[PDB]
Design a protein around this ligand. Structure first.
Ligand code: CA
Ligand code: CA
Lengths: 524, 195
């Protein structure tokens, strides 16, 4: 998920701006639900996740809000020491303790079968895994265990808030790990990394499970005042694409998302390349991020630098350099011909895949079932970047000479395959676009409807977008919430006219007006 | 425009409902009602996801998923205890929201051929009524996904598998490059002086 908030001094109009882009996948019926809520002193328009009694992406009379997933460290795994004589007992604070046991019955559609399973809890939480060979059970502690309803209440209070103080109070009560973003009609912006973050033992390495014997327990939760947060930061804006809140904020086992190479660079690049901005500028930045080949930011310069050293003797390398330099780093289809516009992007994709394999297969190949998702992560490839650029690493993966040989061998192999299958001219390399549908199964991993078969180009983009300007009169702007508002399909097969009537807007970078004033709502 | 009870509901040209109420209790009931009008089967299935009852509808392919959901989830009584710890008014509004969903359920089962969507007919089952605890279940099924992970266990396995092939000193260095303590050059949303 991505977000941007723009303060008064960075906005062309002098009004604070907000952009939302939650990434919750693409399903029909959609993951979001758009609504307008109007009662005395409470007027709010926007969307929330399906089933939520509150808006997460939108604006009330006073403020606009959005959120992105925080990735903060709110889950710890405890390594319980089991009694060798009784595997339902674990050692805790000097004594064997009994696990709480629970029998659960599942009715399964075939007639129907009934199957029983037993689940266990310890003082730390549910037991998730056994290492019986080691006399260990692993239990899971969530910092927000039992406080999910307080998080709902905090979000409702954010809806009812009228100013920074009230919004911040709501933020301080939210217990799960999100980033919250705020913009108001007075020109203020604010950012909060919300959640209840535990005070951990300083004797353990928080990238690994914690021994469960009692010496290493959490000692409460830190004050909200210690959560990363800023009101009206000096830079005049905040952007986020699930990246790190601030320099010294840590997240334990999940640091793999917060490295030097990070996808938020697309938003930073776009905001820093401009002076004052408006909503149209924000949309251009979203477009770039949505179609960017993310490895280009750090890896295309490295590739060009290497090829340029050998272009005198290799004419193919000189051609590649020219094509790479003129490429705008996107995989886009502006002429809607079904092929990505830059043929060299197909070369670059295959170059990267070859380079990543050659960097790590000979060392991490044997653990790649666990490490490929780290070293080729969707948010960035920091370790690969450090190895190829010669920056300091703890292990000496490759010398600079060995890294350059990898870059060259990967180039040769990718070019040889394109020459064999397509030809020598880059226009012949242009790859067919990848498409996506709004299907029947969301991230919750169970079916919730029948989906849609309408194909649109894949985009690295929010499942909805709002663009909001907090004008003196009221929030104004535009948004899209695909596939459509209404999920109902009649018994006879007749589709609601609002089942997928926002797909064309989404696919074509068009939007519908943000409605707030009742006179506008009535004519909309 | 239509007045459902004492709330005026204006559906715009994209079908989005805009609710005009005299108080929050009426507003939140209407909110649950319109969401059920539009999305009842989806709501039912999201709730079954949290309760671990998907396999009742979709069969044995979802048994292990239902087991995970029940293993890590909460009983109705535990959720009710959470609701009882909220501010009085907030609990009451969540109850109103559930009453609105239930109002549509009750209307739909009276006219199932017109008001129950095709999935219920095709899969041969009916929606049940809703309580406030079920609303909390709808929040948990999706929000917890973004918070819950077992990467600590994967990390332990990476280190152990590296150690047994490469030895401890090399494995530690490799692991520190894979899962770092803090990359001081990672781009950040704010600066420390902004705190
Ligand atoms: Ca942890
Ligand atoms: Ca094209």
């Amino acid at each position: 998920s991505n977000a941007m908030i723009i303060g008064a001094k960075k906005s062309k109009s002098g009004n604070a701006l907000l952009f939302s882009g939650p990434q919750v996948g693409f399903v029909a019926p959609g993951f979001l639900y758009e609504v307008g809520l109007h009662s005395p002193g409470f007027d709010m328009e926007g969307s929330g996740f399906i089933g939520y009694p509150f808006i997460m992406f939108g604006a009330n009379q006073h403020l606009a809000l959005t959120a992105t997933a925080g990735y903060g460290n709110v889950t710890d795994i405890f390594e319980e020491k089991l009694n060798p004589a009784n595997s339902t007992q674990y050692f805790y604070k000097g004594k064997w303790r009994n696990m709480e046991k629970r029998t659960e019955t599942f009715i399964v559609r075939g007639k129907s079968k009934k199957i029983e399973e037993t689940f266990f809890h310890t003082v730390h939480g549910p037991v998730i895994s056994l290492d019986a060979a080691a006399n260990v059970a692993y239990s899971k502690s969530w910092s927000f265990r039992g406080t999910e309803a307080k998080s709902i209440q905090a979000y409702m209070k954010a809806n009812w808030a009228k100013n920074v103080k009230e919004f911040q109070q709501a933020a301080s009560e939210f217990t799960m790990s999100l980033n919250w973003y705020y913009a108001d009609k007075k020109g203020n912006i604010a950012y909060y990394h919300v959640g209840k973050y535990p005070i951990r033992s300083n004797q353990i390495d928080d990238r690994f499970p914690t021994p469960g014997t009692g010496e290493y327990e959490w000692k409460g939760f830190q004050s909200f005042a210690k959560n990363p947060q800023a009101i009206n930061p000096k830079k005049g804006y905040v952007v986020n694409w699930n990246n790190k809140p601030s320099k010294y904020w840590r997240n334990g086992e999940y640091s793999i998302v917060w490295g030097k190479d990070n996808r938020v660079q697309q938003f930073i690049n776009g905001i820093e390349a401009r002076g004052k901005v408006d909503l149209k500028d924000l949309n251009e930045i979203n477009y770039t991020a949505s179609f960017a080949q993310l490895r280009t930011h750090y890896f295309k310069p490295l590739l060009i630098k290497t090829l340029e050293k050998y272009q005198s003797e290799n004419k193919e390398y000189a051609y590649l350099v020219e094509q790479l330099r003129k490429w705008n780093n996107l995989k886009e289809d502006k002429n809607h011909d079904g092929y990505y516009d830059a043929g060299v992007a197909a070369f670059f994709d295959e170059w990267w895949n070859n380079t990543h394999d050659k960097l790590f297969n000979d060392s991490l190949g044997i653990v790649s079932d666990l490490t490929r998702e780290i070293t080729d992560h969707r948010m960035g490839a920091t370790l690969a970047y450090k190895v190829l650029s010669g920056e300091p690493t703890n292990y000496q993966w490759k010398s600079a000479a060995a890294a350059e040989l990898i870059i060259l061998e990967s180039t040769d192999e990718a070019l040889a395959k394109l020459h064999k299958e397509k030809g020598e001219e880059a226009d012949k390399w242009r790859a067919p676009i990848k498409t996506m549908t709004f299907g029947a199964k969301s991230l919750i991993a169970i079916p919730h409807g029948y989906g849609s078969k309408t194909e649109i180009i894949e985009m690295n983009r929010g499942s909805e977008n709002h663009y909001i300007e907090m004008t003196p009169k009221q929030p104004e702007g535009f948004n899209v919430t695909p596939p459509g508002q209404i999920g109902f399909i009649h018994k006879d097969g007749t589709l609601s006219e609002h089942y997928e009537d926002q797909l064309s807007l989404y696919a074509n970078w068009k939007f519908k007006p943000f409605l707030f004033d009742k006179k506008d709502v009535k004519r909309a | 425009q239509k007045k459902v009870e004492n709330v005026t509901i204006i559906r715009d040209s994209y079908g989005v409902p805009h609710l005009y109420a005299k108080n929050k209790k009426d507003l939140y009931k209407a909110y649950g009602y319109v969401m059920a009008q539009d999305r009842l089967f989806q709501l039912e299935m999201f709730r079954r996801g949290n309760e671990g009852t998907v396999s009742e509808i979709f069969g044995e392919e979802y048994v292990t998923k239902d087991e995970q959901s029940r293993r890590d989830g909460y009983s109705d009584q535990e959720i009710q205890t959470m609701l009882n710890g909220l501010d009085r008014e907030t609990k009451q509004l969540i109850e109103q929201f559930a009453e609105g969903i239930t109002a549509y359920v009750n209307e739909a089962v009276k006219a199932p051929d017109q008001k129950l969507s095709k999935e219920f007919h095709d899969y041969g089952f009916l929606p049940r009524k809703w309580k406030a605890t079920d609303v909390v279940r709808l929040y948990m099924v999706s929000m917890t996904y973004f918070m819950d992970n077992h990467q600590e266990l994967k990390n332990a396995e990476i280190l152990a598998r590296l150690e047994r092939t490469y030895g401890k000193e090399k494995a530690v260095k490799m692991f520190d490059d894979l899962v770092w303590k803090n990359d001081l050059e990672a781009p950040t949303s704010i600066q420390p002086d902004d705190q």
